[PDB]
């Protein structure tokens, strides 16, 4: 169905940024979590998509400021229409990168 | 005093009642030539007289080509939203008359072609099925509030346009085929396995088969498996539903 | 308003690129209105009649 | 400028031939043969609507006319308001882009027939075809075009159809009808394929 | 009203509908076998012989079991045309 | 698969995926994410917002802190279109609202 | 058939999750989703009632009672807590 | 079918849960749930009779009523506490 | 949908393959998305420090190769996470 | 059509090398026109100003409609001789 | 395809014309029909193009192509001179 092919290319996008975002040097492993909007049977109204990064850090490897950013960039370019105001970066500890 | 500023009052009442009229004209049951024409013009006169206070009147004068372009806009989003929905009512009637042409209903097209005999009664049965799930989910309240919603999303006033958009529209002829083949695909299926069987039996002793067994069996066979498919249409009613209201939403605008 | 004088501007720089009430006007305004309205009506109908002509087709 | 009340008259009268100008200036009658045939083809001469398949198509007309209606909106819509230009020099200068239109896709020989059905001999240059002689061409053409994508339209299912006879007949079957069969195998070729959004596609790029 | 009544309601009628047709077609089906495998058995095979059995059988299915279809159908058609009033929305 | 079904799988599905980014946290040793995605209907105006539960089991002694508690509702409340987070309700293995 | 499946299936997970409360031993949630009235002037909601059987003595602490109402309300669309009811196994209103 | 199908379920499992409750042998739970109307005035309530059969001496305690009113009534969609009935297995109305 | 996304994990290949091609550069990651924007991780061989000049010769080409990208939209960043944009 | 863009790369590609101090070249074209053209110089095989031109110029009339200031020409140090 | 490959045919038998001119050694062609053309000669040792060489290849060029302005060739010689 179209709604099984949307959620197939959801769930692709989030795993090809994920990798993307372990090659770097200082990560390990990462999450990304996409949400993309909705449409309604009324109403215009759009919903900046959104993103949620979980990094998890080599030992000791803390992200550079330039590294938040860059992780920043590259994930709301990889959404169309995605605000990086809307992307939240988090480490292994639960501290908010962004 | 006694004024009464008419031309004002005019253009007020004026482009909200082509905008509602030209729904209603098209919208699903809204469209359906059993409601007498008088009704149909007072229940857009109604609904214009309690919506169109509230909107910015405008002033462009009916003699005028701007006049000419707003009618046309108005025209093409009120039938725009009714043949959007009634692209699921479309859809049902071609999955029902591909389940009835397995059937062997009407045999009579494989042979002639538009030869002035065909009756797709099952198609017929689904699609007032399908209108009475309409009304129970009050899809036509949806239409009516989302036809006053495209006001605040695409104002009277002659605003610039798009263009796949039209496409999206269009596109969405696909939807019609797509959705059907499912609804079939409940029933063909085996029906197909059935004639597949079928198959099994002239593989046996030549000819004294097909035309005179097949026939009744699949018939039968076709009416009860899809008496038992019925009441699997609904979530696929609501799905369709959905589907052609969010279209709607999205590409509208 | 604000967007008013940016409209005033934007005008502008277009020429740059191109280079009591009485019974007397009570009725006049009345009589005027009742032409216009039915003008449209009849447009309307006009193009309400050649769209059913269209959907009326055979394909 | 004339009077405005026969301005009026004028409006309302070409207000008349809207289905006229739909069907012989614009595609239309191209999209609704093919739609036609392609239904024909599918073997269900009522699985959509006729509704549905005329409605398809003015959307698509929409579209496919919407540069000619920017070409109309500038030389037309907007001058007549600052009147530059206006009444004649521009209904005229409005309806050049179909003329424009038209002549892209009418043939040679459709021209060359109407026009000797004219007497019309010192018709030398290719912009200044009379409507006369340019609308008749241009619906025997768009006849032609529609008559051709219908035909295109029609090989697959034709060799669909054709195949399945052979594996019936083949696998010693010589009675099974095989259109029965073959219905839902089309109806899966041409959903899997998603043949309507390239069939639309074919069209817009067929002009 | 709710959407279970209404497909309910489709779901009975077109019981009652496979109720109706059951019988003739049933009943042509099993003439139709019976013929096919005795013309399988004597080794005769014309198309046209088949077809003659099949218009009897079926129109003695009306004399013996027509009056049953018309006392079940007219039920159907009078208790829907009574509880019209009740499912209304 | 039915329209409903799509869905309904679709939600188990984010559920499961930030259940698991949840646990993957240092001092988380397993997550539970319940989403609660609502209606449109004809008789209301502002559709009510979605919301969240997560209850997570915390390693022996391993409390989770202020910004734990912020960046799990931020990750959360973004998963989830519209998803405000003040709907977000994050408890732990004892009963104790986190947030 | 499809809506109340749904219903069964949260029912489960939620007092699943209940369970997974340390000092919870089994719970049992019961959800009461039905249609709402415009301009009945009072209508009414969503309603859930939740029995909990605690661990020997494990008392359920005033945050406990608070964060079952908050997962409860959360889980299910539109859900006032002020609608959720906590019960004990000995008949004892916790909410 | 479908419909008394589902008030039969929605019976056994409330029964269940309300033996569960420590005093509790067994509960037997009756619903009467009317027809529904979508005009704009026809309305009726459902109502609920529960019959408990309490272990030997086991009196339920006040709190403990409250909470079985409570269960069943979140569980019935619209069901006001006040129809809601309990009985032991002697005839007391506990309500 | 398939033709589209197959058509974008291809262009994403060939414009990390050229940008890898440039000695300094070892390996490329080339992340695309259209409603357009560009992501860009350069690996650089050991204290291969990529110049002004560099980092705008990878804009261009990652902007040209992408209908109507504005450079602006294309982020170039390292394998230590620094943003040579 | 992709066919048709991926061989007219490979052509240019090709005629660009021939030239002396190319040793490979490498062509992108994005047809909705512009160019990226990637070259692999001979070492120290510097290209002169004249030689940029005449690679602008090929890849420009290889392109229906290609207006040459969409062609950016890199060398492999990432040197932009545009 | 088959407008592509009568395309390819074109470039090659141009090209093959432009090498059989004394002074060149291999020509390369590249055509781009919406005209507009490229032409890449290598020369013999020394061999320069006269002026009228130049306007000749250009004739030819232009007259292969329907519809090809000469103003639209490009010639260029292997050590990247514009002769044009």
């Known amino acids: 169905s179209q709604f099984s092919e949307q959620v197939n290319y959801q769930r692709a996008l989030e795993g090809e940024l994920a990798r993307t975002i372990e090659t770097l040097g200082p990560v390990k492993s990462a999450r990304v979590h996409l949400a993309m909007p909705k449409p309604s049977l009324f109403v215009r109204e759009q919903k900046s998509p959104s993103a949620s990064v979980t990094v998890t850090l080599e030992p000791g490897r803390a992200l550079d400021e330039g590294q938040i950013s860059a992780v920043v960039h590259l994930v709301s370019s990889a959404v169309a229409g995605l605000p990086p105001g809307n992307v939240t970066l988090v480490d292994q500890s639960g501290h908010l990168l962004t | 005093v006694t004024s009464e500023q008419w031309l004002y009052w005019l253009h007020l009442y004026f482009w909200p009642l082509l905008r509602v009229l030209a729904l209603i004209s098209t919208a699903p049951i809204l469209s359906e030539r059993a409601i007498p024409k008088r009704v149909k013009l007072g229940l857009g006169i109604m609904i214009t007289l309690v919506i169109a206070p509230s909107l910015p009147a405008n002033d462009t004068p009916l003699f005028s080509i701007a006049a000419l372009w707003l009618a046309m806009q108005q025209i093409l989003i009120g039938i725009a939203l009714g043949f959007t929905m009634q692209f699921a009512f479309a859809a049902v009637r071609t999955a029902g008359e591909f389940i009835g042409l397995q059937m062997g209903l009407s045999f009579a097209t494989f042979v002639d072609p538009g030869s002035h005999l065909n009756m797709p009664v099952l198609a017929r049965i689904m699609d007032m099925l399908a209108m009475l799930l309409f009304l129970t989910f009050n899809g036509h309240l949806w239409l009516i509030s989302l036809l006053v919603d495209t006001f605040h999303t695409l104002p009277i006033g002659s605003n610039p346009v798009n263009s796949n958009a039209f496409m999206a529209l269009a596109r969405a002829g696909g939807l019609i085929f797509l959705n059907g083949l499912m609804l079939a695909l409940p029933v063909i299926t085996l029906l197909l396995t059935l004639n597949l069987a079928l198959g099994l039996l002239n593989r046996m002793a030549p000819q004294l088969s097909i035309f005179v067994i097949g026939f009744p069996l699949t018939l039968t066979v076709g009416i009860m498996l899809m008496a038992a498919l019925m009441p699997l249409i609904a979530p696929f009613c609501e799905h369709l539903f959905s589907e052609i209201f969010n279209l709607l939403a999205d590409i509208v605008s | ?59 | 400028s004339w009077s405005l009340s026969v301005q009026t008259l004028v409006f309302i009268t070409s207000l008349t031939f809207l289905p006229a100008i739909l069907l012989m200036m614009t595609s239309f009658t191209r999209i609704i043969i093919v739609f036609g045939l392609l239904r024909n083809a599918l073997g269900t001469p009522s699985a959509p609507p006729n509704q549905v398949l005329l409605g398809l198509a003015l959307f698509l007309t929409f579209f496919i006319m919407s540069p000619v209606i920017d070409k109309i909106y500038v030389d037309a819509y907007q001058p007549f308001s600052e009147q530059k230009i206006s009444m004649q020099e521009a209904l005229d200068k409005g309806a050049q882009p179909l003329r424009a239109f038209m002549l892209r896709q009418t043939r040679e020989a459709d021209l060359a027939l109407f026009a000797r059905l004219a007497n019309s001999g010192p018709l030398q240059g290719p912009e200044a075809v009379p409507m006369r002689i340019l609308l008749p061409a241009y619906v025997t053409s768009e006849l032609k075009t529609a008559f051709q994508i219908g035909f295109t339209i029609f090989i697959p299912f034709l060799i669909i159809d054709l195949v399945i006879a052979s594996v019936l007949m083949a696998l010693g079957m010589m009675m099974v009808p095989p259109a029965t069969i073959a219905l839902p195998f089309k109806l899966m070729l041409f959903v899997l394929v998603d043949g309507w959004q390239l069939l639309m596609g074919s069209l817009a790029q067929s002009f | 009203m709710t959407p279970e009544s209404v497909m309910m309601m489709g779901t009975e009628a077109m019981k009652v509908a496979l109720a109706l047709a059951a019988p003739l077609l049933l009943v042509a089906l099993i003439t139709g076998l019976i013929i096919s495998i005795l013309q399988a058995a004597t080794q005769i095979n014309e198309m046209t012989l088949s077809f003659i059995p099949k218009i009897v059988a079926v129109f003695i299915a009306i004399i013996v079991a027509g009056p049953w279809m018309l006392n079940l159908l007219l039920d159907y058609v009078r208790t829907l045309f009574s509880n019209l009033p009740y499912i209304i929305g």
């Not at chain 3, 409209?7 to 009742?34: C, E, F, P």
């Open chain 3, 1 to 59: 308003a604000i967007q008013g004088i940016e409209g005033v501007i934007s005008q502008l720089q277009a020429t740059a690129m191109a280079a009591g009430i009485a019974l007397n006007d009570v009725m006049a305004d009345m009589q005027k209105a009742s032409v216009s309205m039915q003008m449209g009506i009849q447009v309307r109908n006009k193009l309400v009649a050649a769209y059913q002509e269209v959907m009326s087709m055979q394909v």
